[PDB]
Design a protein around this nucleic acid. Sequence first.
RNA 1: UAAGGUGAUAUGAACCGUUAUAACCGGCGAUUUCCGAAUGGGGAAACCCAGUGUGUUUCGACACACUAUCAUUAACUGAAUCCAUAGGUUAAUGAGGCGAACCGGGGGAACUGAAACAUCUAAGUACCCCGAGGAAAAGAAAUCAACCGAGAUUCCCCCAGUAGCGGCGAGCGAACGGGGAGCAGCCCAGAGCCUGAAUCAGUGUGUGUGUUAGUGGAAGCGUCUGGAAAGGCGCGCGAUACAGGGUGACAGCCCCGUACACAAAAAUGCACAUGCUGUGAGCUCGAUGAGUAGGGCGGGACACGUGGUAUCCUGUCUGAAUA
RNA 2: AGGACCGAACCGACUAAUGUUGAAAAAUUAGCGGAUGACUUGUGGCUGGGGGUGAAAGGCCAAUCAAACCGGGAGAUAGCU
RNA 3: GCUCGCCGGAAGACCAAGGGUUCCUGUCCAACGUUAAUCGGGGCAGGGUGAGUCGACCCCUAAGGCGAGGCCGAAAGGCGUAGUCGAUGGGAAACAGGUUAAUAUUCCUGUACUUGGUGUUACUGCGAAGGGGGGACGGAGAAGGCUAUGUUGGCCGGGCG
RNA 4: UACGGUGCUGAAGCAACAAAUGCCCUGCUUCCAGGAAAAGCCUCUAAGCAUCAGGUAACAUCAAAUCGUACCCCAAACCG
Lengths: 77, 63, 102, 93, 46
Amino acid sequence: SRVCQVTGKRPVTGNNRSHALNATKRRFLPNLHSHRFWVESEKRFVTLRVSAKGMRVIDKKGIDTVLAELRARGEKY
Amino acid sequence: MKAKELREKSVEELNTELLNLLREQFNLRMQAASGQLQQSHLLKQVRRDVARVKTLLNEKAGA
Amino acid sequence: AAKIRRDDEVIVLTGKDKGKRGKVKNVLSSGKVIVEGINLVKKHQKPVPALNQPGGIVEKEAAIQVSNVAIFNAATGKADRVGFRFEDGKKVRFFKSNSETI
Amino acid sequence: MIREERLLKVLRAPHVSEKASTAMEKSNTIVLKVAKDATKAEIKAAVQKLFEVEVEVVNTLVVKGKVKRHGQRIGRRSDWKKAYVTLKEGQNL
Amino acid sequence: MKRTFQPSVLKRNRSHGFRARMATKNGRQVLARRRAKGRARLTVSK
RNA sequence: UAAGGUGAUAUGAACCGUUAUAACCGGCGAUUUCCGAAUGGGGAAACCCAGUGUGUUUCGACACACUAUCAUUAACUGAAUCCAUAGGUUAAUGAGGCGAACCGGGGGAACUGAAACAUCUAAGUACCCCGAGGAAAAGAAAUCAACCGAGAUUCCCCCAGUAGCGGCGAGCGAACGGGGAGCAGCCCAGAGCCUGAAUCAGUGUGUGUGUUAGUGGAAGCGUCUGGAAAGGCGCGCGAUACAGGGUGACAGCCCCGUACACAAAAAUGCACAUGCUGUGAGCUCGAUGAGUAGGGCGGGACACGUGGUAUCCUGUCUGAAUA
RNA sequence: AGGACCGAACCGACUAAUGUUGAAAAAUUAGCGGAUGACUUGUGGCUGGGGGUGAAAGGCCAAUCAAACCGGGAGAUAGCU
RNA sequence: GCUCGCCGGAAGACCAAGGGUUCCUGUCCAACGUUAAUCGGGGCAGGGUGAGUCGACCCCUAAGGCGAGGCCGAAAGGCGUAGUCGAUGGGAAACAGGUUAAUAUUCCUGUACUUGGUGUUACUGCGAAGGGGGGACGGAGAAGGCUAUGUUGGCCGGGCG
RNA sequence: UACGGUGCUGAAGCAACAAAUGCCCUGCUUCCAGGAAAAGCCUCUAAGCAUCAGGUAACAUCAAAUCGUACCCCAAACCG
């Protein structure tokens, strides 16, 4: 499943538009990446399937507060 | 004395159920297979009695 | 409640005979009573084993409807209607316009 | 000792006394129409308790019910199981 | 000719049977459709 | 409620009661095989085979209860590795599946029309999937308006086939404002102060209104035709009942009824006057919600087809100020 | 030994005749090809429709195939009968 | 009942699939039978399938299917480990004679075979999703030794045509 | 004689020869195209148990449940 796992970006649909304004339907799937994040509090590396914008959210908020938001959202890591 | 089941509101009716089934409903089925007349109403009567004493054994654990 | 019971002297109003009067034998579930000497019919009974072995032209009572036969007032020689007026478990039937219970 | 007596209602009816049952009676065994779920051990214990006779062996057979009705209302007879219980010496039934 | 219908109860009860239908979601849909139609013989089993 | 019953084709046999326990109807309770989400494992639905624990026994074996998966929580165990952690076991609570339509969301056509067809239309329709409720969604202004002002959402009637969009073709099509239906606002990001002070649920003594059975309930007789009067001819009567259905032809007064009065053990729907429990009122002011608003590049929605194109949503890349 | 030879079962289908409102929605009767192999057959499985499979013919996919069958768009549209 | 003809590597018999009472008996001849039918696979009624040894079930696996977690998916779902299914294969054991109108390796007679539980006597290191062995596997061809079976001879019971 | 079928008795019941595509044969030979799996079965130990449990031989006893079994048997009962 292509979910950002911190912000929930999902493959969204909207059609290709040509020069002759033709509408063939395509997908806008996210920039998901599997990255291992070091947590100081639990002293353990943790993997996460995260978009690049989600890693911007990581570097802005902090790893532990977004992990606490995941645990309050009731979703496994 | 309040209900019409005072003969089955007494204690230890499981042997009454056993006497009502064992050889009673059995021999009634035996001569019903052989073929008689008062048996025709008798087996519905004893089947209803067995049902009644079974629910009286089910409604209380004291008998 | 039932206006005519098992054993009451009743008189007919409509249907073939009018003035002949008899005692009701039984009330059918469908509302067609049997009252003797009223709806006679001689049928043709087949030769069958056990019950009615030879058959014949045996007369038996046919079924008269409940609405065609009324309860006869004993005191005055008329047909009368009856109604119920009591409050506890027994409802007495009383003669209408005679006000006498049965 | 014996199995519980409320399960000793398996014996339904003996037979119609047709010539297979009666010829097999005068040779060795009685024929019983029994239950649908009665084990051979249950038929044997039921004979030895409800009748007074000991039984050597039981042969169990279930027989298909017939259709037996015409095309206006198709029916089926209920299935039943028949037991030949073997009573070799001192047969009183 | 070898005719088209060659009967086999194993193949029948594994292709169009109740358990062959209630494993798949669309089989559950066809069983519910036949229930809504009101049929007596829901599947081919009996 | 009761003098009649043991459901129908369906007669018969054998019986049960006759105002006090026949049947029938109503409330609550009891049993409820097997399959089926099927849930102990498996399977060709309605079958095969288990494990553990209690009980009975010259002993052949039986009876009952539990044992699926997942989520959350609690306890105990617990590797690579030292601590931990992953994992395993036990216990609690919940879910699963079905359902005709309505609701929200993830996807999403083509025939057809354009007298062809690709932009457009059909159409976010048909269909698939997910989820919830008795309704759902939306909902309390970073909204409209125009220098006057209205004050949340939804629904109906106009505005109006209008402004507008558009191979400016086919066609799509608002808003402002007005008349209605209903009309209730609040809370956290917060400390202190007085602190179940008013609301929201659960549970309960009691009343009222219903429901699930029902009880009374008016008044018609002669003659004629006729197989049979309910029809015809006379004389009466009831009507808060002349709605309706049968009764041997067309019945207000023959029977069920109907109008209208009455009735509830037992369980449940609303109003709660109401006792207890859980959440919390009002004075000062710190902040009033940052990878967000905005932007670049592809798209989608708004009547609006990127056009001079505002507004909303974001797949990629950036990115402020904070009354 | 042999994708050897003659020839039964078995597999197939080259010629003729009859059938063609047939015994049969491709068969019967004479002949015919292969018949230890790239054979044939029973049982169970797998591959699903712009897909499968094909010693290749648009062959076959349930007596249906230049694109299966069933239900829904759907009363498609029909300047044509 | 006597003759005649047809098949006899089946047009005989027994299994498997499939079907489901079509089997046997009494009765009937409207409807079916390409005709009548006294007859039938037809109507109606009654009867009938007997298992420790034959199959299924059971214990194992193949192709393949389902799959706790798991990996991948816009949902639906796709794949797959542990595991759990799946015979068309591998696992224990019964034959001969008789019987019914209809059942027979099932009933009866005779003679046996196999696997477990329990009790006793004597001896004693027993112990597994573990290791090993076995199960355990092809095509073709040639003997050799047999048996099922058949012919002849003897023997016996009849014939004297 | 129910005219099919029952009670009693029942002689000989042996050799030689030809015998398969069946049995030895899951054998032998030969060849390349190199010919399933697991369980039952036979041994060995691991953790454990030591007059225990368990195994082995004999004997006795008990159990082997449940389902199918009729009939069609290359067809008038299957598919047409």
